[PDB]
Amino acid sequence: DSQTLVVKLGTSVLTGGSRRLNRAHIVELVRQCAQLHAAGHRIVIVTSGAIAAGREHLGYPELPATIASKQLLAAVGQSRLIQLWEQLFSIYGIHVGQMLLTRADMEDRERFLNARDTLRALLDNNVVPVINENDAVATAIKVGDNDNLSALAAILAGADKLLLLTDQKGLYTADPRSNPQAELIKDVYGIDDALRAIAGGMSTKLQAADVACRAGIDTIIAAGSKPGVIGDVMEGISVGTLFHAQ
């Protein structure tokens, strides 16, 4: 019966590839999350967009390429990002709990177990956790974070599936934009099989699929804009590239 599923939303899914956060699109996703929540499933959101959101809200100001500029953007953006997620879910009367984690926080073993406990406490009490890199405080630029963070979250939260919503249909045999040849690779079996099958942020997705399948957790790369995507993934309907678990 009652599945647990982590959904990762990268920046382009969230902005619909614009430089403004796209609420029509997000609400479309929240919706699917609520239907499953109402069926008594457990949902975890790993959200990007903190910086995008901060640029928007501040009217795209001109800033030095310091770390302090990524961070202040992130401070402002996350306050909005969270509010946004809080309100959309609130519509379907589901609560959300904001978790900001650093790459550091995760390698610290004690904090790692803590987080496991808290994630489960959240779900246990029907709350959707909305996790993100703690970018206003995180020392380390971007860079596919987030993909990895999400696969950690999948483990800690005891996930049955990890869904990596991106701006293309899955994983291809080569660059599809410059290629009439490219297949959408329906199934993959662990990373080594991926890297053989293929001889845009797509490497860190291959990376997260590793960490997660090696942890017993199926992981999917799929288009975030595909109607009904999230439910379909629960039912194991084929929808993008499925990276089976070991």
Q: Which residues lie near its own copies (CB under 8 A)?
A: 54, 57-58, 61, 63, 66-69, 71-72, 75-76, 78-80, 82-83, 86, 95-101, 105, 110-111, 114-115, 117-118, 120-122, 125, 127, 129-130, 134, 136-137, 139
Closest to 130 in 3D by CA, of 30, 219, 52: 30
Q: How far is the CB of 75 from its own copies (least distance, A)?
A: 3
Does 169 appear as a known binding residue? no
Does 200 appear as a known binding residue? yes
Provide DSSP, 127-182.
Answer: PEEEEEE-TTT------SHHHHHHHHHHHHTT-SEEEEEESSSS-BSS-STT-SS-
Q: How far is the CB of 15 from its own copies (least distance, A)?
A: 20
Does 47 appear as a known binding residue? no
Question: β-strand 4-9 against 42-47: which pairing, if any?
Answer: parallel
Determine the Cα–Cα distance for residues 150 and 9; give it in Å rounded to an integer.
9
Q: Which is nearer to its own copies, 77 or 240 (CB)?
A: 77
Burial environment of residue 215 by CB neighbours within 10 A (0 to 12, 13 to 18, 19 or more): middle
Q: Which is nearer to its own copies, 2 or 125 (CB)?
A: 125
Residues forming the annotated binding site?
A: 8, 48, 135, 146, 166-167, 200-205
Residues forming the annotated binding site for ATP?
A: 8, 166-167, 200-205
